[PDB]
Design a protein around this ligand. Structure first.
Ligand SMILES: Nc1ncnc2c1ncn2[C@@H]1O[C@H](C[C@@H](N)CC[C@H](N)C(=O)O)[C@@H](O)[C@H]1O
Ligand SMILES: Nc1ncnc2c1ncn2[C@@H]1O[C@H](C[C@@H](N)CC[C@H](N)C(=O)O)[C@@H](O)[C@H]1O
Ligand SMILES: Nc1ncnc2c1ncn2[C@@H]1O[C@H](C[C@@H](N)CC[C@H](N)C(=O)O)[C@@H](O)[C@H]1O
Ligand SMILES: Nc1ncnc2c1ncn2[C@@H]1O[C@H](C[C@@H](N)CC[C@H](N)C(=O)O)[C@@H](O)[C@H]1O
Ligand SMILES: Nc1ncnc2c1ncn2[C@@H]1O[C@H](C[C@@H](N)CC[C@H](N)C(=O)O)[C@@H](O)[C@H]1O
Ligand SMILES: Nc1ncnc2c1ncn2[C@@H]1O[C@H](C[C@@H](N)CC[C@H](N)C(=O)O)[C@@H](O)[C@H]1O
Ligand SMILES: CC(C)=CCC/C(C)=C/COP(=O)(O)OP(=O)(O)O
Ligand SMILES: CC(C)=CCC/C(C)=C/COP(=O)(O)OP(=O)(O)O
Ligand SMILES: CC(C)=CCC/C(C)=C/COP(=O)(O)OP(=O)(O)O
Ligand SMILES: CC(C)=CCC/C(C)=C/COP(=O)(O)OP(=O)(O)O
Ligand SMILES: CC(C)=CCC/C(C)=C/COP(=O)(O)OP(=O)(O)O
Ligand SMILES: CC(C)=CCC/C(C)=C\COP(=O)(O)OP(=O)(O)O
Ligand SMILES: [Mg+2]
Ligand SMILES: [Mg+2]
Ligand SMILES: [Mg+2]
Ligand SMILES: [Mg+2]
Ligand SMILES: [Mg+2]
Ligand SMILES: [Mg+2]
Lengths: 272, 273, 274, 273, 275, 269
């Protein structure tokens, strides 16, 4: 909990995030994947370059969010979805618009919760999409009532075994769990300074790919897909590294992705 | 002669050389005892109006997946050593060497397949790099952490997952890479469907669930880097083979099980942590 | 579930004479096999018209014999105790159990047909208020924690995951309670499942486990075996006799042969809920 | 080891209730018996040679269980090797050899018992097949999977179950057979009753629960083939011994604990998978 | 429910040993453990006095209340709103001290209906019966709700149950971040196996002593991370040697003293956090 | 291994360390415990006296560690996982007169250790060598006692304890002084993460230490929190000029209890 408060007294308090959500209305708090489109990007000497760069970055960010939903498997309007650490509800809205089902979000930031519902009412879907302040480790959802859940870059803030144990609980048998995250590669040995820098920067705790796989195995979660998206997210960062929205953590990511001490992966497992 | 089962599973491959695996291995010289992946080039194939071209197409797909497997062995130099658990006739071994120019140690229960492999190995003039030998993949002679990469290309249904991965984990160097292409019944389905059981009775093997594969690896310091379902890629191969005359009579079991999702063809590449 | 949905359809139909014509002479319809020597006396000679009629009786006797043998390992059980039958079939064992202990006997099966058949026959005996079968997955039963005095799996554990099934029994089973199971498992001493075993799996569309899995699964679920006996020699007679009858289903060989070379074995395990 | 040290003390030190029985067959056993008592040929207290007949009866029952144990070692030829963890004076070892004519390696902590065993072994002219040696059953010199069958006849209460079974599992050949006759407190009872604790304090040992035995075996690739409770078979032995004059003063603890079911005498025969 | 406990309950439903009651009278606090800390021989003047034995009982009781106090020192911060649990509370000696020191709720649990009533009886006298309460119940299956207990402990009562099951329970009703403490005697795994001395103690109290190894592993398997692990053998030795010369002797003094000497048995204290 | 190269580099490549080693002759790469000799310290050559005080505290904890190695004769062998420059190794030998095998990833530290070892004329008893503490050459159960003095944050707990448990004799003694984030706090606080990024290491939770030992036949005999004892050391070092810039992270984390300095001595069961 003492750490939980650290996270709450954090997210309840950037440009590189809001200005992008300002274009679509979809506010994301994760990273992008995909080939940069230097077509619509234009050159650095145009009256509205930075404006086009923000659009490109946001596109990539919405791109991975969409990519995540592709692994939630078949899901009808009667099913319920859970978003552990939903942020401002960006992914939640997309999910609903795409499946027209119930989407329950959960976050530690009362600010993010309200922001999500606020934006939810505007779209007139507040009765299907709802964010609430709650710890993803102890959620109110009943056993096996959720068709699919996921963690889009929010698993570095909690204990893997405990979090997957929860998902496994409220997740229906045969249900689908997905997660996009950054984990230090066990093949490298131990967390490199780069990774530690990212932890100190976001005040989180990155896990190894080994922990992710073992944690899932110990919680009746059998991976159906395990793909390394590092090559897909590299473009996003290198582009963001040249912008002015830079937060100062770009190097840590780019470098760690380069030497392979850190990796961006996606895992979709079944609730067996 | 480890166990009574491995006596039958050994006598099997020692006394069984079907046309569907030889006639194909003939076109190249590389003999394969597994299945293929990828789309079918019907253009260059033509219609049944041919059989010689069909064998080439089937063989292409089979060599295609073998190549696909090697793509997941990661970087490997001429100084590294590779192990092939249940190498069969050495098809994959030859390709591996030609592609990396390193040592390739194969291991099989069939003395026939072993000799066949080395025989063909001498012809290519690589017998001093590529070598097959009669031995149980569960108790191999390779020393601890001396192997750069190993794999199981459709041969893990003949042994206990924990024991086999435990062995690989042993002789495999820290940071090494392990890969495996296999067919496992989907735990999402519940239990092995009749189709799967039919395949077991046909090949006298024991197919595992995707759950066992993942847990077994986790219990043996094997962290999966890639886990892809190749069912959609292998379907074409079977449907085509189903129309040929090389048919062995197990085509239906595969096609059907792949269809209803009770059985799946997957590829897993994990690191030796 | 997709798999279980398959076993439901399988049994909803069935109607094998080798199974009904035997439970007719008693009302105790069993869907398992039998142990014990053969009473060739009451058997007689094949050159008789009522021979087949006597063969069915003999086979049924052996089948009811093992069912009785199973109950012998449930330990002391009074009229106030509750018993569970994972995969009860038509209720053959359930009726015997009640008649023998006069207690509650809750059965559970995937076949709605078998369920109704069981209750139907249950009302005839006038015990429907003590013996009841219901359509439900033995892996997720409605019985409350530690309220069951004893439960068992009479040839039905090949249709589910051992850890999950024993975990359930361990749940609703009272501390100190007794669990029993009669099943066929491939002997790990042999190495791997022989073709014979695989043939049996494909035939019944099931999934036989190794004796190793049974023991480990129980150990991981607070189930300590009190008795572990190999009944292969006791069930052999049953099969060899059935192999000569006309009720033959075509899987007789697989069993006989696998039992012979020791790749497959018929065992009974009775463990305590620690 | 400090424990083993003083467990060796005990053993380097001759109960009449032990030697006097073994002096009738040359079969020096150090355990208890099973089987119903033959009152007829036993005798009536109203006679002189009664006690002499009682010793014979008790010894018979003790050799009876030893024989019963060997019945669970499965097939074993003259070429096979057997191990006796905590062999005592070699009683069971001699019987084993005479019955299978194979190598029988014994191991004990008591140098006295070792020499006694070999001494008696030379007399029978089998010292080149049957041999006892001072060594800890937890760290034996036998090579991996070279033993056809091993066992613990009332000697597992002196060591850690996981470690001891781990050892047996090591030197035991795959498919080999392990057997053990012992007394363990029934987990069904809850915890060790005073009776059991009294037995521990008496023999300076550490009785385990039936739960530990089963779990320990499962964790060491030992799958039980047979698990039978011999309490009813050993009761007669004790009740008879309770009336004799060889009484050591621990008879009650056993009889009572067997009665209330807090303690049980069981036999377990498992395969080395 | 269960043969064994069925006994333990019967066992304690008799008790009445003077080496317990005469020592609990001097103060009003009725303990059922042993003491720690050096002995004040000076306070035990002219052995040839009608008051020596009276002073010896006071000294022994002091040492016994001393360790009880020492245990509470490891319960960490605890306010009047928190709830504490005493697995195998005995007559409530430690419970009363705990409350007087923290003024919070103290739930005790024992198998002896006699000890339970005695505890509440004495609890009403102090006028704290609405905060301190003992009840007949198995510490392995307690009625307390999940994570509602701020701190719990086992003061020499863990030898009567299965470590994994008991710690699993504590871990259940114990709040996340909560504190668990336990003072007990366990045979040192460094010695090998339970020496006769230990077995004698088991047969004497009809219990089942565990190894320090089981304690540590059992806790690790139940989300209980030890913050402190101290061997109090040297601190409890004085208590026994003194008690060995008294007339309250129960006949188990030697087993303890000797086992503590050769190191086959040890008196330890463990304070872990509920992670 | 790739990570090992990083750490190797780190060490092959400070004054606050060697300066203090100049006085006694012992070179420690850890920290100190115990109260400060506030009086006899100062308020001209103040800095010279401050270095002596800091070094005293550092040698103090090193000594404190050896106190938990239990009885050890001249015939016994000791292992120092991540020995650094051999400071603790020398003290150990001078105190027990036995064999002291050290192991480090830095060839520089290894040679420095042996160099200094020859000067004291004990090179035939005390020896440092370049090797990974996870895969040491020592034979099974031949070591009487081993330890990790602030070096366990550079390796996997299960693997490292598994090794110690291997070469360590049954009944042997293992000790370790380290900093671990308190699981009671929840997760690693920024302070801890800052320390990781600073030393390029990976701090573990007290939970991992205890579980890892339990899984490797290592039963803790003593578990004491030395945070209050090491606080003085840091606050004093925070005012000196040897400051490396990581002082705050430590002091603060120790304060809010998100990070703790503990000592664990377990037996090889
Ligand atoms: N323990 C926790 N319980 C619930 N939510 C948390 C917890 N820790 C962090 N979070 C939230 O997880 C989210 C992580 C963010 N990167 C947002 C992820 C979100 N999927 C998005 O795409 O925006 C933030 O809202 C954090 O506040
Ligand atoms: N237990 C075993 N140990 C070693 N080899 C085995 C074992 N079981 C089966 N095999 C061999 O593994 C191979 C399985 C075949 N499907 C061939 C696979 C081979 N990788 C190929 O693609 O040609 C055959 O050579 C089997 O004889
Ligand atoms: N998952 C399941 N849940 C409930 N019942 C099942 C399940 N799987 C199989 N069964 C039933 O288990 C029974 C197995 C049969 N051999 C009957 C066993 C029964 N004890 C008897 O001897 O009559 C059948 O009724 C199956 O339908
Ligand atoms: N750690 C040990 N290693 C080897 N033997 C032991 C050990 N501890 C006890 N023993 C022996 O275990 C034996 C137990 C006796 N009851 C003899 C058993 C023997 N199987 C018999 O049938 O007589 C004694 O000879 C002990 O010396
Ligand atoms: N299974 C059990 N469940 C609950 N309490 C038990 C159980 N077994 C023993 N006890 C209690 O353990 C207690 C141990 C006694 N030494 C009292 C300890 C108590 N902390 C005291 O200081 O008095 C006894 O009061 C027993 O009643
Ligand atoms: N894999 C490794 N094998 C051996 N040593 C290592 C390894 N990783 C890190 N280290 C050592 O970790 C040590 C950390 C130092 N603080 C040790 C100081 C030492 N305990 C002393 O007080 O002198 C460095 O000296 C490294 O040499
Ligand atoms: C997909 C699965 C589960 C494969 C198991 C391994 C196996 C029996 C290979 C045989 O291939 P083959 O090429 O030697 O024989 P076939 O003639 O059938 O191609
Ligand atoms: C140990 C093994 C292999 C058990 C098989 C369990 C099973 C499916 C029994 C059905 O018997 P049944 O009596 O209903 O059908 P049949 O009489 O035709 O065999
Ligand atoms: C748990 C069990 C059965 C322990 C028995 C230990 C034992 C055999 C002790 C002495 O040998 P002995 O039994 O030959 O001597 P005695 O018959 O005089 O007790
Ligand atoms: C240290 C160990 C193993 C204790 C277990 C036995 C126990 C609960 C003693 C305390 O009770 P008590 O104080 O009433 O007993 P006694 O009358 O001997 O003081
Ligand atoms: C969690 C903790 C405390 C880990 C220890 C990290 C470490 C190597 C400290 C000593 O460094 P050093 O002595 O080489 O340099 P410094 O002068 O900073 O102590
Ligand atoms: C993948 C990892 C380790 C994430 C940890 C940080 C986090 C939860 C979000 C970062 O994106 P953001 O949009 O919320 O913040 P920013 O884009 O400003 O970095
Ligand atoms: Mg962003
Ligand atoms: Mg082929
Ligand atoms: Mg039938
Ligand atoms: Mg005797
Ligand atoms: Mg007392
Ligand atoms: Mg320093």
């Amino acid at each position: 909990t003492p750490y939980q408060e650290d996270i709450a007294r954090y997210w309840n308090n950037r440009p590189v995030n809001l200005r992008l959500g300002d274009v679509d209305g979809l506010y994301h708090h994760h990273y992008g994947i995909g080939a940069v489109d230097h077509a619509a990007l234009g050159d650095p000497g145009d009256g509205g370059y930075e404006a086009r760069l923000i659009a490109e970055l946001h596109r990539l960010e919405s791109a991975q969010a969409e990519f995540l939903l592709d692994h939630l498997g078949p899901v009808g309007p009667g099913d319920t979805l859970v978003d552990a650490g939903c942020g401002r509800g960006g992914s939640m809205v997309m999910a609903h618009q795409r499946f027209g089902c119930k989407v329950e979000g959960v976050t530690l930031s009362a600010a993010q919760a309200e922001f999500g519902n606020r934006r939810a009412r505007e779209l007139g879907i507040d009765d299907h999409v709802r964010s609430r302040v709650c710890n993803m480790l102890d959620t109110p959802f009943e056993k096996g009532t959720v068709a699919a859940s996921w963690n889009n870059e929010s698993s570095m803030y909690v204990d893997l075994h405990d979090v997957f144990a929860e998902h496994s609980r409220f997740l229906r048998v045969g249900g689908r769990y997905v997660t996009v995250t950054g984990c230090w590669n066990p093949r490298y040995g131990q967390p490199s300074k780069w990774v530690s820098q990212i932890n100190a920067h976001f005040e989180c705790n990155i896990h190894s790919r080994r922990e992710y796989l073992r944690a899932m195995a110990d919680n009746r979660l059998v991976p159906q897909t395990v793909v390394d998206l590092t090559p897909e997210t590299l473009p996003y960062w290198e582009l963001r590294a040249t912008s002015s929205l830079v937060t100062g953590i770009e190097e840590a990511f780019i470098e760690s992705y380069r030497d392979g001490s850190f990796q961006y992966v996606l895992i979709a497992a079944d609730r067996v």
